[PDB]
């Protein structure tokens, strides 16, 4: 400890992931100890949900990982369906998988662009954020909200895709692969980019597993693991894609796992615009998913359900469950107890960042100060999920 610095992100640089107050110890330029202080964005989400019905609680999940909106909703929905012992219909499962990979595009565009922003490479941020816009419109037209949809729900989705949407989604996918090449042409082979990333933040396979790392923080270390291919949930047992794998387990690989994954999604989206079946989009069980308006305004048996399902909510059998999904950042998952009534008794959330951030100290040992910038970004941290 030559001198300790309490590096605070008060003047939040354009990161859009929260503010981190970091407490460090520089033995000159090296970092002998890095200590994160996180609670700045703890709002009490895990305790508010105790007072909300299972439906009312859903919007909270768009607000944990606010760059992976629909992905979160899928995790919460899968958990509840599993508790309710019901299966959504195939068309919904395809829409959810369709958007689950569109969101992954939104998230990885955020991670790479900002991570490249914190290191001064600014131009790629604008180019790719013009693709996010067009990707929001798809979010916009199916739910009405640019960012926070609440579209996915226990028992399927809310509304069906408006006519002519998939024509646009196909059009968007057709041109996108050129966009990435416009990006890799900047960062992939650029010597400056390699200098800031090569052999930085190396994590051994054995340590990653113990430290709880998941997602691209594993596959960078050469581990072959991705919940989609190993514990598939909706349809992922019906799509051909290859899981990228790292070699040296440093920043540059994790930059290539993410860029590579963004391609593999265009390989999945392409498949979901072809295999999408006709049918309805919510479980045909009017005690869980509310009935159509036209039937609500005509039939008594339906009117009652539209009443209870929007005031008391739908009970849930008592039980506990841990459900996780390969969210873009890592292994997002929720341990959710249920006491039998309409309000969950407890909702623990396993934010992927929370595990990674603990490992920040480990990865920053024997690294210069400016590497702590790169290390935080490569973990793809958003402090909505970390603090909750």
């Amino acid at each position: 400890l030559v001198s300790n610095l309490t590096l605070n992100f008060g003047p939040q640089h354009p990161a859009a992931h929260g503010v981190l107050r970091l407490v460090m110890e520089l033995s000159g330029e090296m970092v002998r100890k890095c200590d994160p202080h996180i609670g700045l964005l703890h709002r009490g989400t895990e305790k508010l949900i105790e007072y909300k019905t299972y439906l009312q609680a859903l919007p909270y999940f768009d607000r944990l990982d606010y760059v992976s909106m629909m992905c979160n909703e899928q995790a919460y929905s899968l958990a509840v369906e599993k508790l309710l012992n019901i299966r959504p219909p195939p068309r919904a499962q395809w829409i959810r998988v369709l958007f689950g990979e569109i969101t992954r595009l939104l998230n990885h565009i955020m991670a790479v662009t900002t991570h490249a922003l914190d290191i001064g490479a600014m131009t790629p941020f604008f180019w790719m954020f013009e693709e996010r816009e067009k990707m929001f419109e798809f979010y916009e037209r199916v739910s009405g909200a640019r960012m926070h949809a609440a579209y996915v729900r226990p028992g399927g989705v809310h509304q069906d895709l408006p006519l002519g949407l998939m024509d646009d989604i196909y059009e968007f996918s057709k041109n996108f692969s050129l966009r990435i090449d416009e990006l890799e042409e900047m960062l992939t082979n650029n010597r400056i980019w390699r200098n800031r990333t090569v052999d930085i933040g190396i994590v051994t396979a054995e340590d990653a597993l113990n430290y709880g790392f998941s997602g691209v923080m594993l596959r960078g270390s050469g581990i072959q693991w991705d919940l989609r291919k190993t514990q598939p949930y909706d349809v992922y047992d019906q799509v051909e894609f290859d899981v990228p794998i790292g070699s040296r387990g440093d920043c540059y690989d994790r930059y290539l796992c993410r860029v590579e994954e963004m391609r593999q999604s265009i390989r999945i989206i392409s498949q979901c615009l072809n295999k999408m079946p006709p049918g309805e989009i919510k479980v045909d069980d009017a005690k869980v998913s509310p009935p159509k308006r036209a039937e609500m305004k005509t039939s008594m048996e339906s009117l009652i359900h539209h009443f209870k399902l929007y005031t008391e909510g739908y009970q849930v059998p008592p039980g506990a469950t841990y459900t996780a999904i390969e969210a873009p950042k890592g292994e997002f998952g929720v341990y959710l107890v249920s006491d039998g009534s309409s309000r969950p008794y407890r909702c623990k959330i396993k934010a992927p960042g929370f595990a990674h951030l603990a490992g920040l100290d480990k990865m920053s040992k024997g690294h210069m100060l400016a590497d702590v910038v790169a290390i935080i970004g490569t973990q793809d941290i958003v402090f909505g999920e970390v603090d909750r």
Partner: protein, 176 residues
Amino acid sequence: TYKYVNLREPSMDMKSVTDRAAQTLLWTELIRGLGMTLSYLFREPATINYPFEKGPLSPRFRGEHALRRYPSGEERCIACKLCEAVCPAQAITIEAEPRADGSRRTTRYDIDMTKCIYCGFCQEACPVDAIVEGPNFEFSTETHEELLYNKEKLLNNGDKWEAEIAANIQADYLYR
């Protein structure tokens, strides 16, 4: 399935090495990045000239809450308090009494717009299409109190946007 994203073993023949040497000593790769940017300098920027132009939306868009009327003129809300019971943020406050003619109607209807999360659950729950989220998204105010809508402020939005709220539902109610 899987695939190695970085497992190359560059050939060490003289031509191969000279290429890498030619790359380092002359900044070839760095130049190639400059080429890409130089192309964007000659493409039409994606900037819309707001306010004279507006970023496209869709009929489902969620904006300022508003209260509708039947074609006759009567109010649609019947103080069923379903919107109040599902609003996740509890931003809706309803207080109703039998009306002077015996009808069931509200007396207090405040939508605190600083606790609303624009979820849209209110209109999903209303059984008579009374409380709906208009398409207006430009109502930022200069004081906090102006965002605490009361019933009089909600209807006026209804009697001000009905020429568009009505059109949108016609366009989209089928998906509901």
